[PDB]
Amino acid sequence: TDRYSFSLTTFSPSGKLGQIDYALTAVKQGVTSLGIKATNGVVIATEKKSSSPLAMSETLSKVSLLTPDIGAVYSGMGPDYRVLVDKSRKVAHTSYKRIYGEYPPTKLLVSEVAKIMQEATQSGGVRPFGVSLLIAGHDEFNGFSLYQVDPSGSYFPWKATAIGKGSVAAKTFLEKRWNDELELEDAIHIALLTLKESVEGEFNGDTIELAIIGDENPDLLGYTGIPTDKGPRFRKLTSQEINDRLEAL
Amino acid sequence: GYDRHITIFSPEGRLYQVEYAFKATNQTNINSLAVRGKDCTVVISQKKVPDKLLDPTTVSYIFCISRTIGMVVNGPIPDARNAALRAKAEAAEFRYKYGYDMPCDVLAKRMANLSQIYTQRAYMRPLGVILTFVSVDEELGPSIYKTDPAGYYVGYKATATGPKQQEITTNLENHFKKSKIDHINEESWEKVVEFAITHMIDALGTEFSKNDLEVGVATKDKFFTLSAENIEERLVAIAEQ
Amino acid sequence: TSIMAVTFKDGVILGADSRTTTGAYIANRVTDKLTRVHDKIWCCRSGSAADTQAIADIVQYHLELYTSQYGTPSTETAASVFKELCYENKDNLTAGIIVAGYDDKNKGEVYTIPLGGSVHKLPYAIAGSGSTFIYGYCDKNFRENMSKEETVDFIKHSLSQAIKWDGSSGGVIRMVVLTAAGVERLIFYPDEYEQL
Amino acid sequence: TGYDLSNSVFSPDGRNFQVEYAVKAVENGTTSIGIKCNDGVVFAVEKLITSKLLVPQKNVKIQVVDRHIGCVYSGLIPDGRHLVNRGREEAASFKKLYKTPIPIPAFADRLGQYVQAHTLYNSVRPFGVSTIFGGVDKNGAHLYMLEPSGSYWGYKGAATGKGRQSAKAELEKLVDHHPEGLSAREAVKQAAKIIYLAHEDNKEKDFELEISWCSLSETNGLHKFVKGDLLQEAIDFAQKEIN
Amino acid sequence: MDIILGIRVQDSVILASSKAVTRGISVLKDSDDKTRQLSPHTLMSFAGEAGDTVQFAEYIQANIQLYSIREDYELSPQAVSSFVRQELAKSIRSRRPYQVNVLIGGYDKKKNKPELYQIDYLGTKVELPYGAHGYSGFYTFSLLDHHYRPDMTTEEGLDLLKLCVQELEKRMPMDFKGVIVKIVDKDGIRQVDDF
Amino acid sequence: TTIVGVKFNNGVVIAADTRSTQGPIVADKNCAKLHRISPKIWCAGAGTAADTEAVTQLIGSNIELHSLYTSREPRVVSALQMLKQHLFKYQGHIGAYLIVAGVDPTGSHLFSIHAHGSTDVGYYLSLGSGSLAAMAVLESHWKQDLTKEEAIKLASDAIQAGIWNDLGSGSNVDVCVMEIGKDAEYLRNYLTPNVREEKQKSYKFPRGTTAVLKESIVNICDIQEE
Amino acid sequence: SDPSSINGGIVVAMTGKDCVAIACDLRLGSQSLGVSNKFEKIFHYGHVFLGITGLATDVTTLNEMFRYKTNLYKLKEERAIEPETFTQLVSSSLYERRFGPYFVGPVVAGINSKSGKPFIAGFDLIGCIDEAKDFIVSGTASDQLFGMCESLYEPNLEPEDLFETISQALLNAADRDALSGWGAVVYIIKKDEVVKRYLKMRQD
Amino acid sequence: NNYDGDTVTFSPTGRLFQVEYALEAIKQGSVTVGLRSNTHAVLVALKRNADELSSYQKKIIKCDEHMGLSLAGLAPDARVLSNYLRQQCNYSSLVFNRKLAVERAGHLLCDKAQKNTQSYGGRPYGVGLLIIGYDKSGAHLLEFQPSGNVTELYGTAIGARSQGAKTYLERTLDTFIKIDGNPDELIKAGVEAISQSLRDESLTVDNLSIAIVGKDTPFTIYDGEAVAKYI
Amino acid sequence: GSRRYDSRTTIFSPEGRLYQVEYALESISHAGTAIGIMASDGIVLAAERKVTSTLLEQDTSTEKLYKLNDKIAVAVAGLTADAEILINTARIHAQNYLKTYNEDIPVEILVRRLSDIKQGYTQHGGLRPFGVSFIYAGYDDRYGYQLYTSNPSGNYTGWKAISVGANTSAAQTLLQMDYKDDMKVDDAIELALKTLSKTTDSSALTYDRLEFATIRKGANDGEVYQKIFKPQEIKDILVKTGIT
Ligand SMILES: [Mg+2]
Ligand SMILES: [Mg+2]
Ligand SMILES: [Mg+2]
Ligand SMILES: [Mg+2]
Ligand SMILES: [Mg+2]
Ligand SMILES: [Mg+2]
Ligand SMILES: [Mg+2]
DSSP: OOOOOSBSOOBOTTSOBHHHHHHHHHHHHSOOEEEEEETTEEEEEEEOOOSSTTBOGGGSOSSEEEETTEEEEEEEOHHHHHHHHHHHHHHHIIIIIHHHSSOOOHHHHHHHHHHHHHHTTTSBTBOOOOEEEEEEEEETTTEEEEEEEOTTSOEEEBSEEEESTTHHHHHHHHHHHOOTTOOHHHHHHHHHHHHHHHOOSOOSTTTEEEEEEOSOOGGGSSEEOOTTOOOOSEEEOOHHHHHHHHHTO | OGGGTSSSOOTTSOOHHHHHHHHHTTTTOOOEEEEEOSSOEEEEEEOOOOOTTBOGGGOOOEEEOSSSOEEEEESOHHHHHHHHHHHHHHHHHHHHHHSSOOOHHHHHHHHHHHHHHHHHBTTSOOOSOEEEEEEEETTTEEEEEEEOTTSOEEEBSEEEESTTHHHHHHHHHHHHHHHOSSSOOOSSHHHHHHHHHHHHHHHHTOOOOTTSEEEEEEETTEEEEOOHHHHHHHHHHHHTO | OOEEEEEETTEEEEEEOOOEEETTEEEESSOOOEEEEETTEEEEEEEOHHHHHHHHHHHHHHHHHHHHHHSSOOHHHHHHHHHHHHHHTGGGOOEEEEEEEEOSSSOEEEEEEOTTOOOEEESEEEESGGGGGGHHHHHHHOOTTOOHHHHHHHHHHHHHHHHHHOTTOOSOEEEEEEETTEEEEEEEOHHHHTTO | OOTTSSTTOOOTTSOOHHHHHHHHHHHTSOOEEEEEOSSEEEEEEEEEEOOTTBOTTOSOOOEEETTTEEEEEEEOHHHHHHHHHHHHHHHHHHHHHHOSOOOHHHHHHHHHHHHHHTTSOTTBOOOOEEEEEEEEETTEEEEEEEOTTSOEEEBSEEEESTTHHHHHHHHHHHHHHOSSOOOHHHHHHHHHHHHHHHGGGGTTSEEEEEEEEEETTTTTTOOEEOOHHHHHHHHHHHHHHTO | OOOEEEEEOSSOEEEEEEOOEEETTEEEESOOOOEEEEETTEEEEEEESTTHHHHHHHHHHHHHHHHHHHHTSOOOHHHHHHHHHHHHHHHTTSSSOOOEEEEEEEEETTTTEEEEEEEOTTOOEEEOSEEEETTHHHHHHHHHHHHOOTTOOHHHHHHHHHHHHHHHHHHOSSOOOOEEEEEEETTEEEEEOOO | OOEEEEEETTEEEEEEOOOEEETTEEEESSOOOEEEEETTEEEEEEEOHHHHHHHHHHHHHHHHHHHHHHTSOOOHHHHHHHHHHHHHHTTTOSOEEEEEEEEETTEEEEEEEOTTSOEEEOSEEEESTTHHHHHHHHHHHOOSSOOHHHHHHHHHHHHHHHHHHOTTOOSOEEEEEEETTSOEEEEEEEEOOOOOOOOSSOOOOOTTOSOEEEEEEEOOSOOOOO | OOGGGSSOOEEEEEEETTEEEEEEEOOEEETTEEEESOOOOEEEETTEEEEEEEOHHHHHHHHHHHHHHHHHHHHHHSSOOOHHHHHHHHHHHHHTTTTSOOOEEEEEEEEOTTTOOEEEEEEOTTOOEEOOSSEEEEETTHHHHHHHHHHHOOSSOOHHHHHHHHHHHHHHHHTTOTTSOSOEEEEEEETTEEEEEEEOOOOO | OOSOSSTTOOOTTSOOHHHHHHHHHHHTSOOEEEEEOSSEEEEEEEOOBSSTTSOBOOOEEEEETTEEEEEEEOHHHHHHHHHHHHHHHHHHHHHHSOOOOHHHHHHHHHHHHHHTTSBTTOOOOOEEEEEEEEETTEEEEEEEOTTSOEEEESEEEESTTHHHHHHHHHHHHHHHTTOOSOHHHHHHHHHHHHHTTOOSSOOOTTTEEEEEEETTEEEEEEOGGGGGGGO | OGGGGOOOTTOBOTTSOBHHHHHHHHHHTTSOOEEEEEETTEEEEEEEOSSOOTTBOOTTOOSSEEESSSSEEEEEEEOHHHHHHHHHHHHHHHHHHHHHHSSOOOHHHHHHHHHHHHHHHHHSSSOOOOOEEEEEEEEETTTEEEEEEEOTTOOEEEOSEEEESTTHHHHHHHHHHHOOTTOOHHHHHHHHHHHHHHHOSSSSOOGGGEEEEEEEEEETTTEEEEEEOOHHHHHHHHHHTTOO
């Protein structure tokens, strides 16, 4: 029986929560990921840093669909991210869709993920999650949005941001280039430029993972005949689609 | 220094108990390797029976998880069998609930999630094993998915595990750089097995008798292991060319 | 429903009609009542369709997990798993199951598990509402160690008669043959068996 | 360090020191062995006569599980009894659902998984026994040995406890000198000898020999204790070889 | 138990409740007071199944007294009646529901208004100028519908009540042994001691 | 209610009428009885309408999560297995009778499921109070190797037999066609053979006809600033 | 003894041109006994209106429950719940009591503040949604209301004509039901004004 | 030392110190002797008083008509274990109409003690017991330690200075085992054996506790004047 | 076993203090300052966000000021994630009370509940306390306008003006200097911003580093309005009070 019913994260004399600080350090080591909000979309992007070349890195998905209009990326511990994605997909249903018959708005799904992360910071016998998330989404009444969630459970909305390794440089790069009139293609172009700085090796469609929240894709719905159902706004760009935009770089 | 004893973060954001579980993974001093054919997935592993009082037929690190899925384990046998039993239970339950055979990659993910939990919950220790799952999947074709004590997993064109994984890995990488395809372009699994043994011999710089190896083969709708005699017939064909 | 299983020289054969009724309405006239729980362990189901499907799905799961750990289960082991479910949940089930299988050690075996969850190993077994009408015929005509062709004939003639007299039985006669050689499925249509 | 103060903690070299310390309790126990013969298995153990006051024949150590399995162990005797109690529950529940008595390899894994479970948490201590066990099932005879880590394999012969090295070498000779195999009756005689030989490392006290066997031909595949005349004859054959 | 009536006049609420307690064949008591003071300006009368009536009423009383001490404050009649309704609504889907009907007469010191709430054992709540439970309304409401005025004095309320009770004593088959009458106003709760 | 499913060459078609009733009263004249479990797995329900909707939504939700978890498109046999085990556990108290059709990587499928948890396989099926009328048409006109157009024709004819002959069924035909390698096409009110004729008279009233005691504006706005 | 006709009462809702109406009687009784003539059965949470017929204790409980839930919805979503969304919430909430249900017949009416589209829906006691283009009825005189609505209703009535239509549907339905009447209220709802009218009717 | 904080920790030489410390509490306990013939089994126990105003603490507990024990160590632990034995004797009688074999009682005690040696939060029992009985295979004597080791013996002793009694019984073995059909002689050999463990004090009438069970003799305890005969 | 790794979050020090409460208070002293001021005609809440960025989406951002219901708001100093757990609990208690009594929850009853929840984490369960101090601004018809604070001990107290977070010693001295009982909300608004202006560790006080709210019966006739200021409205009140 789990006999660790006491907190493993506690306050030190200086007021610090050590385990949260250390989770944040694990995030700091993580591969860079970023997101940029345009007027008509959001882009999230990261590097697919393949662990061996015998690994098939398209089978490792760092950018994840949470709902048809919400996607997530991370920096830090991959396995922690994968389980959070499973829980986030589920909670979108159990605490929202099965009640209201519609997917949650971005900010409330973020809220639910954040709560899960907060509880790993206070509940008995567990450590905090060693990841920061960037969550991009659209919903009818709030439009496009982009949030960061940290190991403490704190979340903040951004116009554009970066997390992980090269984030201090990437954020300065983004402050120069961001304005409130970017069109989604502009934000994609800026994302690719920003991401090049933190990437050492190969830089192409097979080593970059990029997704957008944009227009509804009726072609990805899987059925026709219900006028109000127009398709998911989340879309992962292909290897080829990324490379096309890398000549325009 | 209690951040070294349980799965909490060190001041550099590390999990030492996970790192040490990876170290236990090489305690059997066994190397294994897996490759993909056109129709099959082959896994081979060294077999060492260092005691004459042992019944060698009971010494194995290859497991038949379901009809379609095989698993080779790198690590001590108690943790290996713990993982094998669990994987068998999960595969059977999956088929009962969802009405179709559990895919290789989904089982790997599931076992990887369980492993992730041991790295976050203090009362559970990580298992000191690396798990290589193989099948010929009905949607994805020949499949290799490998899990470790960090709860990480990924699919492979080919892979190797053990004290000398690097030599085997670089040998395999060199071959695939040449061939430029994601698999062994061979019709028969017999030849894919011969390829696998041949490249292990090159990479380790050692020869094998029929009792020095363990072989597992996945084909459409089954996974099976080879007898010493099927292996002998493999070895003979390798020597005669 | 009319179902039976018959051991013979090379193994065992299962037979069934294909009619399932809701009162007097035939809800399905081409039902498959011969259900596979392992490669060479099959069963014929009678009673509540919901119950017998639930039971068989659970047994299939159990024998899949048994196989993963301990190799091929015996027919007796399969019968024991069926029995455990039927006996322990007897208050909440209406299930009468015949279990038939082929081993290489044991060859063809037949077990019947009637309503209360008792088990009975038999050379052959009959069950379902239609079986009442062929107790006399089957008892007179069954021999041990029949050939495959004779056993197919015995079952075909037997279920012919059950179907003739029982309103709840009908459609096609389905059979499954279990031997060393494999698993063979047979089907016989009304225009054949009605003229017997 | 401090890695050895708590069960289930990996040391920096990937070891579980509490399990290794359990092995020390095993190495400290009396010698026990098993010999796989042609159609069965034989188990034998050295019982130290701590005093005259011990009633001879009366503190039986070898334990039956179900009707076809024998178990013997060295180390902490109560731990071994706990493990056999669990094995008896596993055998009963297997036979209840599946009808057939539990096969020996299936039984081996039940004990193995349970012993391994006691290396997963710091709230329990590993088993301080190594257990030699086996019997006859539908595929023939099987002999196993299981360690405090949960590790087990099948064996031709096995030994544990303080006189383990001596017994092993004896056991190896038998394997070399009989590739065709040993009869159950030969195995009983050999088992008596090997325990007598291994008792050197324990010579301070006298001992009492205890043997059991399951043989298709000799016991109908049931586990039985070797008693009376057949026991004496094996004691005599052993006395001769140490002389 | 049997008859419970209430009437809310200009400046007070009057509750009238029968005195009989009948165990089948015998009238065991003829002076039973079917009421509990919940707070200084709130009174609750009750009728229904034996045992459950008094158990429910004392349970409600204990709870309102607890609230009063905790907050050093008297809940409004509306707030008390909502609390009581929720308890009965929860009780109706219980293993064994409270079979108890109540009237709550309170004087709201903040609004300076008398208030009468009628609540049945299902948790059906209604605010009324006058109300009753059981068969009492069948004999009395035609009289109340005729004579009631929202500006009546307390004495006119009592006289209209006398008439209601006289009609009950005439046409009702059971002998309910008269009524105990209590008045709830700005000064609290008092018992009219001859009726 | 009349609902049918019909297998054809390269797919499966389901159809339903559009009347829901409370006893002998028509509660809704254009009910939607074809439910989506997933993009290419649809089902039609008879029995307790809340239950057919609820059980369909629940398994649909869990199927979507399963799909994300396994990175695979949902299978009809999974919907079937999850539905039947849920229904079986509730011992018929969830009054859902369903025809479940769909396409998935494994092929095209058609099953029925009964409230107690039994399931069946076939090339043509009908459920509901109109099922005997529908089945009479299916048994008369079904054949092997139907084309898409023939199966749509047969399915809607079968629903029509229920509409005209079963008092429990009426109004319109809804169809959903699931073809291998294509988007499922949902054809709402595919047939509309029951439009009400114009009334003899308009019953619009003169304004001021109704007697009113009081009017007031209702505040639907939050508490206001200033 | 049938819980859905102990207290009596009716609700009807209709769509018109850029408007909706919802109306109810004011009776609460205990079977034959009239108890209150001021028991309103229509509630609103922001701009979404909910009428509930059936067992009066459940009418009150559900109003309190939906006030509870729409208040929390608002604090978290930072906007008022819409009719379509609220309809799903009512259905979810009713079905959660599948095997011990609230004995009610709810009716939702309102206009989506973003699309301007008029919306109505009805439910059985267990959450099955009837989303009608024309009208929804509920209560002990629902047969009578179906009869009135089916002949009196025509699409696209202006708010002031819709008022007469719905009022006459209610009034005449109620007068053929022993357990309905004792007053009536009609809400006329447009995108940014709602008017409430109490009708004069017979008091027997 | 770093390994003696709880029962769930092996030392680097494979020892269990909390169990060894529990064993140490028995060693501080007052001496008690057990021995048997083929017809009877006897317990003798030297009881300890707190001072001259105090009672002598009882050492012998009846478990059933055919079984009982004596204790040395923590007395409340003896109460827990003897209560458990009473229940198990009782269960065997009620369910199977069968008197619990002394050997079976020993196995049950072993297993009960073992559980307190392998889990967190428990502590081992701090008491040793000598169990005598007469069952279908005759007279029996058992020694229980809280390590869970239970041993069948002709005779033994536990507690402070038990070594003297124990050596005596070892020499006498061939004599006392033959004292069949003479309860009084067996008890004498018992009182003589326990005398080999006295110093400073001797056996008095409130000091001495004797119990006996055998062929046609329910387990009975003698204290006070009933032991004067043997003083 | 597991005892070895237990910090024992709920023990007294030898001076009779609660370690974790004290250390949580230390954490809170580095949070952005929050200020509440109570006037006769309303309440002001003002709080400083922790060092921003130009890329932070301010108009959709909330980190200091939260609505508990229509009559009660809080200002947060400390761990934001911890605060949201407690905030959602308080929102639920308020709705439970409204459902039970059909009256809005009185401010203190809400405050006491939240404070009891915090207290529990200091006495049982072996969990760390919430790293949060609240200022509660609200109105009820019993006491009218009210200000409270609570901290990780679960202690709460009522105030005419109060601060929490960074530099409360300096802030409190400044409030005490200029606060007067007959003061009005518009005066309180100015005092709050002037005080933040002087105590901030930032170079200057700008709109993008503030959150601001008022609770006024400046809602028409016997009723109360909460106003969470938009970024532009904070910018205007900075100019109008002459800080920018
Ligand atoms: Mg862990
Ligand atoms: Mg027939
Ligand atoms: Mg009432
Ligand atoms: Mg049933
Ligand atoms: Mg009427
Ligand atoms: Mg009337
Ligand atoms: Mg009336």
